[PDB]
């Protein structure tokens, strides 16, 4: 039945994305430098997330610390010691009243910021890889046992379960309309899920190795995936095919984090070669190089109104770029 | 008081040594997730045994990049699953994020190996000790030592041991091996070699 799917995908392929963006003006060289440097963590930084107020962010390190940073003044508003030292993700609530984390303990820990712990969601089997808030009462998590789940924070029970992946789920991204989300996993595939229904919609198979990060385009109709085959790929939900492939003949390392800008023009990809790249999403050409980390760049995030880009690496340092 | 109270915690992060415990089901690594803290010569070692996840280990093992040492426990008496243990040792030795972490190798279950001798690998016939139990022990040890000296000898080293089920001096060996593991780190950090 997949032969008919591939035949329909070939029949719906008229012209490439780079042909539609062929005779357009390129951005050119992107020059960015570090404005603020945060140094308050001992072990490697594994994850971060920005606030919706575009000022405060959160960061998670392998030493057992979750620190809320004020990006403007390089000050620590809060610092939380964690019961488990290994945390793979952290999310900061859009209302700012709660924070979440999780990792190798297979528990999603949610703390109140009125700092006290509020809830411990315990239903997963494998290592919890990503989590994102929908509201103060619902949360979407993904774990390493090839599952995702939508949880109610009040009763502490799973509301829906998403079981379609054959590999360990590495990342998830939420749509701006909060009606769909995407998940990238370790079977070289990404899946689109409906929050309200609870069933998979579409499956995208264009990569060749384990997909580590995923992020929606700002219009909600496209996404980008970075994987261990040293290539990024841009997919569309309507065209049912890979729109773009961002590759190079000199990159032989994996991809750890991708994120989009405010307009979606620049794709910000973190690599294992101690540096990040700034690709053009339309021209499929590299336009910027950010090299300020002495170890592997683990996490990357974009300010909600596009004023800054904050990266965190395995050299225990957070760097904000403008 | 966020900045001051963190700094004392840094002293705690300078006080303990983290260890990664690995082994198969037949190997008695619980006798040699679960956390075990033990103190030798007023130095705290904190070993982690991970068993709450699946059998795919290529994505969470990167959480143990800054670990001091990997204690790898091998049941020597199991000739059927010895090749799987050798393949696991080869995978941990040749990993990209584990290429700077030294492995303390514990060849457990010596008494059952001696009973199997006194009661798979075709190269055992043309072997000589560097008295059958000694030949079997050093053949099994050199099977791992060939993988250890095949590549990556400069960045990290292997420390084999022979251990029975009634042995109590394993923490002594872990102390001494971690002391040499960082001693060689400090000799290169301090511009001496």
């Amino acid at each position, epitope marked *: 039945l997949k032969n008919q799917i591939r035949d329909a995908r070939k029949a719906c392929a008229d012209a490439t994305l780079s042909q539609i963006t062929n005779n357009i003006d390129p951005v050119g060289r992107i020059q960015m430098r570090t404005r603020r440097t945060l140094r308050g963590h001992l072990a490697k930084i594994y994850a971060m997330h920005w606030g919706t107020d575009s000022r405060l962010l959160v960061s998670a390190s392998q030493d057992g610390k979750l620190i809320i940073w004020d990006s403007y003044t390089t000050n620590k508003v809060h610092a939380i010691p964690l019961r488990s030292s290994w945390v793979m993700t952290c999310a900061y609530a859009p209302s700012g009243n709660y924070v979440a984390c999780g990792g190798l303990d297979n528990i999603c820990s949610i703390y109140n910021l009125k700092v006290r712990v509020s809830r411990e969601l315990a239903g997963h089997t494998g290592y919890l890889s990503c989590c994102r808030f929908l509201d103060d009462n619902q949360i979407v998590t993904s774990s390493g046992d090839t599952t995702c789940a939508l949880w109610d924070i009040e009763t502490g029970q799973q509301t829906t379960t998403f079981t379609g992946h054959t590999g360990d789920v590495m990342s998830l991204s939420l749509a701006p309309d909060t009606r769909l989300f995407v998940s990238g996993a*370790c079977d*070289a595939s990404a899946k689109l899920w409906d929050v309200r229904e609870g069933m998979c919609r579409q499956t995208f198979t264009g990569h*060749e190795s384990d997909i580590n990060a995923i992020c929606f385009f700002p219009n909600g109709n496209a996404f980008a995936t970075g994987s261990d085959d040293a290539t990024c790929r841009l997919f569309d939900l309507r065209a049912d095919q890979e729109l773009m492939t961002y590759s190079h003949d000199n990159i032989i390392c994996g991809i750890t984090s991708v994120s989009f800008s405010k307009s979606g023009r620049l794709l910000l990809a973190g690599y294992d070669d101690f540096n990040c790249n700034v690709w053009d999403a339309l021209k499929a050409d590299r336009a910027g190089v950010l090299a300020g980390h002495d170890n592997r760049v683990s996490c990357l995030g974009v300010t909600d109104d596009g004023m800054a880009v904050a990266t965190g690496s395995w050299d225990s340092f957070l760097k904000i770029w403008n | 008081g966020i900045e001051k109270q963190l700094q004392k915690d840094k002293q705690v992060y300078r006080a303990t040594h983290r260890l990664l415990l690995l082994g198969a089901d037949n190997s008695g690594k619980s006798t040699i997730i679960f956390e075990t803290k033990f103190q030798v010569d007023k130095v705290n070692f904190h070993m982690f045994d991970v068993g709450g996840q699946r059998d795919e280990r290529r994505k969470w093992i990167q959480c143990f990049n800054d670990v001091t040492a990997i204690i790898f426990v091998v049941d020597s008496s199991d000739y059927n699953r010895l090749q799987e243990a050798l393949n696991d040792f080869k995978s941990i030795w040749n990993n*990209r994020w584990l290429r700077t972490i030294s492995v303390i190798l514990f060849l457990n279950k010596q008494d059952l190996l001696a009973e199997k001798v006194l009661a798979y690998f075709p190269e055992f016939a043309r072997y000589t000790t560097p008295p059958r139990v000694t030949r079997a022990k050093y053949f099994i040890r050199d099977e791992f030592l060939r993988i250890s000296t095949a590549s990556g000898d400069g960045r990290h080293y292997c420390y084999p041991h022979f251990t029975c089920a009634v042995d109590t001096e394993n923490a002594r060996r872990i102390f001494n091996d971690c002391k040499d593991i960082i001693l060689q780190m400090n000799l290169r950090e301090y511009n001496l070699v």
Partner: nanobody, 115 residues
Framework: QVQLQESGLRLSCAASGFTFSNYKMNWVRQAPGKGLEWVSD????????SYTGSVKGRFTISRDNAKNTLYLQMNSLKPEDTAVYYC???????????????????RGQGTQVTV
């Protein structure tokens, strides 16, 4: 979408969906009633070749990057060699843990061999 299809005495593994010259290729059996067991491995350029000691000197493993296929030439077989055979690829290019795993996405469906 990656794809590995086995056929098969000489076993063949045809590869699709991925570039073939940048991955190390492995052969893994599964005996009836036993677990998955690693058999042989070959590197990216075909330089480093390793076998299990049970089949050392009896099996040969080769690759064809022009045809993008993996051959196992097996002869002087034994009744203990009756197993289901899979060709495995480990995911990181230019490098390899979980090829002998219970649920692995980068290996084929395998072929039955009865001696």
């Amino acid at each position: 979408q990656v794809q590995l299809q086995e056929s098969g005495l000489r076993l063949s593994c045809a590869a699709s969906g991925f570039t073939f010259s940048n991955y190390k290729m492995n052969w893994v059996r599964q005996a009836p009633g036993k677990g998955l067991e690693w058999v042989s491995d070959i590197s990216q350029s075909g330089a480093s070749i390793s076998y299990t000691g049970s089949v050392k000197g009896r099996f040969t493993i080769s690759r064809d990057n022009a045809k993008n296929t993996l051959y196992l030439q097996m002869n002087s077989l034994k009744p203990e060699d009756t197993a289901v055979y899979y060709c495995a690829r480990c995911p990181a290019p230019f490098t390899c843990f979980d090829v002998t795993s219970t649920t692995y996405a980068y290996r084929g469906q395998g072929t039955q061999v009865t001696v």
